[PDB]
Amino acid sequence: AHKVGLIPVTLMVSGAIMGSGVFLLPANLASTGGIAIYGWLVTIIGALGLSMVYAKMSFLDPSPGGSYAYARRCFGPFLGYQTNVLYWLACWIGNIAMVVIGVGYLSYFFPILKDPWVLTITCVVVLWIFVLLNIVGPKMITRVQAVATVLALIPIVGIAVFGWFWFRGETYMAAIQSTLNVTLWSFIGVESASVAAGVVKNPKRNVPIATIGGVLIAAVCYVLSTTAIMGMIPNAALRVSASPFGDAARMALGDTAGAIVSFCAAAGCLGSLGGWTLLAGQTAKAAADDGLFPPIFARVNKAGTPVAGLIIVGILMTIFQLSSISPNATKEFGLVSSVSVIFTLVPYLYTCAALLLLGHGHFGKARPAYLAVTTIAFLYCIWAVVGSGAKEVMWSFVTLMVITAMYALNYNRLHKNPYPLDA
């Protein structure tokens, strides 16, 4: 019936940011290399800045759930409304990618998991298992995310520690498109604790610490595993198709790296979606409470868990999953990953705008930065949009319009304009 403690929360943030990314990014990145690494560097810096922004903002205002709340204070109910619809959509839509991936990893052990049918079925089942777990509660979901991420660090920490022996000279000059997709994706999760603040005991101290702790851990692992791989698989080796990560895996860990890796990968991927289901429920609840989403989303139980909220998300998730637009259908991760990333960027951007419009004054002698630090978060949000696909940036731009019109229609009486008419 109560909230969650620092360590578990901070591991949740670390895990929001990893799960899929840790194993996808370093492989991918080493593989293509060169121009790609700069991109990676840029987005690392941007994520670190954005994290300071969130840290500071959740500090100022320990409200649930993250950017939704900040955008509502900062601008209107309308920007609140919109921020949540976007972020909410992003959380669960992204799950459609992660189930297919994290269950793919276990195909190593259960060959049958590669018949599309079994894959799809097994996928829906796992989605609902994590819905159930969330219904059990934040404590249950968080404990599982915790064990899951640490498990996923075994292989990352391992390759790092034993890649030092094989560490050498670095070919840094040497497709860039889709790596950019993966790299942008791999650093979403910065905002998680801030969004899940309503469900963390002592938000004001715990959340800012948690987000920086989490980002810091995640930043460290990404850089270490990445440099490690670039250093230990040769430049002429880069070529070897289907190689990349797995190569470093076996050479640094034995001929059981297969099992260990495709286990901790799966571990980090699933149970990370446990956390994203959670987060989806939290924005929606946060918003429904203010009357900026339908009220069923605000409907909680004893512990204050939006069970109907989470159940719905389970339903939507499985409709989408069984749809033709799903990775199970298309065998493609670009659409889902892309909208998932871009729908997060608007919340990011409003959060930055929020820090300044809300927390000027609370800056004092340390003002620029913040100013500096946050125009960096701004430039990263822009960077990410510009580096995303045009089709998908357009689909998000359309979604903005649909959301606008939909608020107009669904809230027309009872809105309360900032500068009303008369008569």
Ligand X SMILES: NC(=[NH2+])NCCC[C@H](N)C(=O)O
Ligand Y SMILES: CCCCCCCCCO[C@@H]1O[C@H](CO)[C@@H](O)[C@H](O)[C@H]1O
Alpha-carbon distance 13 to 279, whole Å? 11
Selection from ligand X, a second copy, ligand Y, none that 251 binds (CB < 5 to 8 A by kind) is none
Alpha-carbon distance 290 to 283, whole Å? 11
The torsion angle over the Cα atoms of residues 400, 403, 409 and 412, rounded to 10 degrees, is -90
91 known ligand binder: yes
188 known ligand binder: yes
Q: Is residue 417 a contact point for a second copy (CB under 8 A)?
A: yes
Alpha-carbon distance 102 to 376, whole Å? 33
Q: Is residue 122 a contact point for ligand Y (CB under 6 A)?
A: no
* Closer residue to ligand Y in complex, CB, 113/124: 124
**HEC readout, 2-66:** CCECHHHHHHHHHHHHCCCHHHHHHHHHHHHCCHHHHHHHHHHHHHHHHHHHHHHHHHHCCCCCC
x/- mask, a second copy, residues 36-75, rule CB under 8 A, reads: ------------------------xx----------xxxx
* Closer residue to ligand Y in complex, CB, 317/353: 317
Q: What are the distances in angstroms from CA 128 to CA 6, 85, 89, 163?
A: 27, 22, 18, 38
Q: Is residue 205 a contact point for a second copy (CB under 8 A)?
A: no
Q: Is residue 162 a contact point for a second copy (CB under 8 A)?
A: no
17 known ligand binder: yes
Selection from ligand X, a second copy, ligand Y, none that 120 binds (CB < 5 to 8 A by kind) is ligand Y
Q: Is residue 407 a contact point for a second copy (CB under 8 A)?
A: yes
**C-beta separation of 238 from 171 below 8 A:** yes
Q: Is residue 116 a contact point for ligand Y (CB under 6 A)?
A: yes
CB-closest chain residue to ligand Y: 116
**C-beta separation of 339 from 93 below 8 A:** yes
Q: Is residue 322 a contact point for ligand Y (CB under 6 A)?
A: yes
Q: Is residue 81 a contact point for a second copy (CB under 8 A)?
A: no
Selection from ligand X, ligand Y, a second copy, none that 188 binds (CB < 5 to 8 A by kind) is ligand X
Taking the complex as a whole, the smallest distance from the CB of residue 182 to ligand X amounts, in Å, to: 9
Selection from a second copy, ligand X, ligand Y, none that 165 binds (CB < 5 to 8 A by kind) is none
The sign of the CA dihedral 280, 283, 285, 288 is negative
Q: Is residue 328 a contact point for ligand Y (CB under 6 A)?
A: yes
Q: Give me the helices (H) in 186-202, please.
A: 192-195
Q: What is the identity of the amino acid at 22? A: V
x/- mask, a second copy, residues 341-380, rule CB under 8 A, reads: ----x---xx-xx--xxxxxxx--------x--xx--x--
Q: Looking at the DSSP assignment, which residues form a beta bridge with residue 200?
A: 4
395 known ligand binder: no
**Burial code of 61-82, b = ≥16 C-beta within 10 A, e = fewer?**
bbbbbbbbbbbbebbbbbbbbb
Residues at the interface with ligand Y (CB under 6 A): 116-117, 120-121, 124, 322, 328-329
Known binding positions for L-arginine: 17, 20-21, 90-91, 95, 185, 188, 276, 340
Binding residue ranges: 17, 20-21, 90-91, 95, 185, 188, 276, 340
